[PDB]
Amino acid sequence: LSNKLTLDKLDVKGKRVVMRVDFNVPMKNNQITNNQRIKAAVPSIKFCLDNGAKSVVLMSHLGRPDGVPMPDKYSLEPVAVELKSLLGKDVLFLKDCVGPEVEKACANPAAGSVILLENLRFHVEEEGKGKKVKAEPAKIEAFRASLSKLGDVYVNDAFGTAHRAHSSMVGVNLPQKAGGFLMKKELNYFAKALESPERPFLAILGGAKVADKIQLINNMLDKVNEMIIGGGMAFTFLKVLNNMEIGTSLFDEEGAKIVKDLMSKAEKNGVKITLPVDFVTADKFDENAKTGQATVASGIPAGWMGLDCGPESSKKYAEAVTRAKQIVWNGPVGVFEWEAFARGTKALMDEVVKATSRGCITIIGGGDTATCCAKWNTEDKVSHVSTGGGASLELLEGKVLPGVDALSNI
Numbered sequence: 001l002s003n004k005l006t007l008d009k010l011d012v013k014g015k016r017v018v019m020r021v022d023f024n025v026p027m028k029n030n031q032i033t034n035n036q037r038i039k040a041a042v043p044s045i046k047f048c049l050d051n052g053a054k055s056v057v058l059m060s061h062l063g064r065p066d067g068v069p070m071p072d073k074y075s076l077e078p079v080a081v082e083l084k085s086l087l088g089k090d091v092l093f094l095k096d097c098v099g100p101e102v103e104k105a106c107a108n109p110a111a112g113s114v115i116l117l118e119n120l121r122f123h124v125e126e127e128g129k130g131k132k133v134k135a136e137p138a139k140i141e142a143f144r145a146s147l148s149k150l151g152d153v154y155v156n157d158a159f160g161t162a163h164r165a166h167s168s169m170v171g172v173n174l175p176q177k178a179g180g181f182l183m184k185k186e187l188n189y190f191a192k193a194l195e196s197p198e199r200p201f202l203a204i205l206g207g208a209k210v211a212d213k214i215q216l217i218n219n220m221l222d223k224v225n226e227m228i229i230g231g232g233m234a235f236t237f238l239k240v241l242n243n244m245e246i247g248t249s250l251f252d253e254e255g256a257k258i259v260k261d262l263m264s265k266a267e268k269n270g271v272k273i274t275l276p277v278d279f280v281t282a283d284k285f286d287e288n289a290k291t292g293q294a295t296v297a298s299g300i301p302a303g304w305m306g307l308d309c310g311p312e313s314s315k316k317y318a319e320a321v322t323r324a325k326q327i328v329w330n331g332p333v334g335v336f337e338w339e340a341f342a343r344g345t346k347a348l349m350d351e352v353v354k355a356t357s358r359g360c361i362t363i364i365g366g367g368d369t370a371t372c373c374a375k376w377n378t379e380d381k382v383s384h385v386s387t388g389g390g391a392s393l394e395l396l397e398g399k400v401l402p403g404v405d406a407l408s409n410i
């Protein structure tokens, strides 16, 4: 960011600031379970308001609505309520992000107005592909032109979304496009932590986003010495390598095609892969599912999903943590939100905290994965908790993030 415009250098007095933030907070029963991401944007929002901004217009995605409006399930209205108490100022929530009324509402606001727009991904044009459909070029441009109308200057503080070349992150057309203080803070910490990692350097890759994150491993394999592939990531690997019965467990069809290549590469680079060997199983995807056990040998019965690892998996995971002097962890190794399926991420968290206390550099990142830290009160018991998960895995790969690359130059 050493040659991008940042917010400390952007005169905002009398200007309308349009700001990309990652307010993609975890939700349950329609309430926010962790305001980490909203809090982390506050310093940039306060700075703008403290420095004479006419308005701050805030925009984000929440979830993966895939280009269909879904106020029911993926509305940002709750974030607007939480943002009020953290700023101690009112937030005008708007029920759309583009179009004549959003434009009217943001055209010339009272001085100091903060406005939050609705979920960008209710419009196919943010990503723009969705549902199955490709966005139309003319309409992407139109959607991008609408968003650009809402401020005089642009700030991108959406670190957690920086890996995404979506319309709101890279397509806003204003003379001045500044990185915010959170983007700044996360990029510096990682440029430090990734410069000369302590070794063995372990990556711990779990979660639910298999299609996307399975595609990151190839470049990661050039950087790390060990890799835990757990959570929802494990089942593509285990079907291919062990012909394991997997049931309704998460599976990536594309990912499975390259699994043999990534294992060949892991070997060629001396990167030790630790995959799970037992499981807690579910009869459906529900907190109060009937539950069971399987090993890789037994397989998982048709009709059932693996939603946590078992105790023998926890033991292997612990051994990898014990050998590490640096850890980057994105993705829980089970569905930690539900207690029937939380023991394995809780045990792995326990290892990671014990590892930190004897000098291991521990870095946990992501919306859901940082919520592990909140839930077990380990936020100050590891080295760094980042608002980015995927964004951080893409910095580990050695990429310039598209949301950083689209910023103005000095």
Ligand SMILES: Nc1ncnc2c1ncn2[C@H]1O[C@@H](COP(=O)(O)OP(=O)(O)O)[C@H](O)[C@@H]1O
Binding pocket: 206, 207, 208, 209, 231, 232, 250, 306, 307, 330, 331, 332, 333, 334, 335, 336, 337, 365, 366, 367, 368, 369, 370, 388, 389, 390
């Ligand atoms: N089979 C499964 N299905 C759903 N979630 C699973 C899972 N296995 C583990 N998880 C856990 O993964 C969590 C999603 O994590 P992600 O968004 O991929 O990574 P990030 O938020 O960047 O750190 C989800 O909440 C569940 O607890």
Ligand code: ALF
Binding pocket: 160, 209, 365, 366, 367, 368, 369, 388, 389, 390, 391
């Ligand atoms: F859900 Al992520 F980084 F993939 F927070």
Ligand SMILES: [Cl-]
Binding pocket: 208, 209, 210, 211, 212, 213
């Ligand atoms: Cl995905």
Ligand SMILES: [Mg+2]
Binding pocket: 366, 367, 368, 369
């Ligand atoms: Mg997540």
